[PDB]
Structure formats: structure tokens, C-alpha cells
């Protein structure tokens, strides 16, 4: 099993994976694992919001950050499927921006 902290580390390890990958098959596995961990983290309650109602604006913001992240991952997967390996890898910068601005502030 995995908790939010575990899934966060999986997400960040596979963000590094995307940046260091050498071919389409590799980036696809990195992006797949990031997407799986993102969906699992999205269902958690982050430490700063444990006193909030589950549908509070803050929890909606937390979850929307992952919806953005998952959309960016899917966009990068499409590029990787098209053989645009370098452009797929470039999504790492924007994934970090989403991660930092939406989710990190709740940990």
C-alpha cells in the first residue's frame, strides 16, 4: 500500500525519470507511473487540509491541481506516442510548475 507521502515521492522520482529518459519507451513508463501516482495522491487529504471539509474550496483546489497535472501527463504521452520524445520530455518543466503552485502548499 501507499499513502500520500509515498505517492508524492513516486511522482517526483518519475518526474526525474521523464527528464533523464533516452527514448520513447522510457518516457512512456515514466509518464505512466507519474499518472498512476497522481490519481492516487488526488484522492488523499493533504496535511494542511485535514481540518477542512472534503469539498471545501481548498480541497477542490488540491484536486484540480492533479486534474491539471494529469492533463499535462496525457498531453506528453500523446507526444511520446507520436515519437516526439524531446517535446514530451519538455513537459517536465510545466509539470513542476503545476506541482509547486497547486499541491506543494498543502503538504
Author numbering: 0 to 106
Give verbatim excerpts from the published study on this entry:
Previous studies showed that proper introduction of disulfide bonds could stabilize the flexible region of target proteins and reduce the conformational entropy by locking the protein into single desired conformation. Here we developed a comprehensive disulfide bond prediction algorithm that not just increased the success rate of predictions but also improved the quality of crystallized target proteins. We applied our method on two proteins which were previously determined to high resolution and frequently used as fusion partners for GPCR crystallization, cytochrome b562 (BRIL) and Flavodoxin, and verified our prediction by solving the crystal structures of the wild type (WT) proteins and mutants. The theoretical and experimental results both indicated that with relatively lower values of conformational entropy, proteins would be more stable and readily crystallized to higher diffraction resolution.
The continued disulfide omitted electron densities of the side chains suggested that the disulfide bonds are successfully formed in all crystallized mutants, which are T9C-A36C, A20C-Q25C, V16C-A29C, and K27C-A79C in BRIL and N14C-C93, A43C-L74C, and C102-R125C in Flavodoxin, respectively. Compared to WT BRIL, three mutants (T9C-A36C, V16C-A29C, and K27C-A79C) show relatively better or similar diffraction resolution, lower conformational entropy (ΔS) and comparable B-factor. These disulfide bonds are located near the middle of helices I and II (T9C-A36C and V16C-A29C) or between helices II and III (K27C-A79C), thus directly strengthened the linkage between these helices. On the other hand, the V16C-A29C and A20C-Q25C in BRIL, the N14C-C93 and A43C-L74C in Flavodoxin have higher entropy than that of WT counterparts, consistent with their relatively lower diffraction resolutions. For BRIL proteins, the simulation B-factors are consistent with the experimental values.
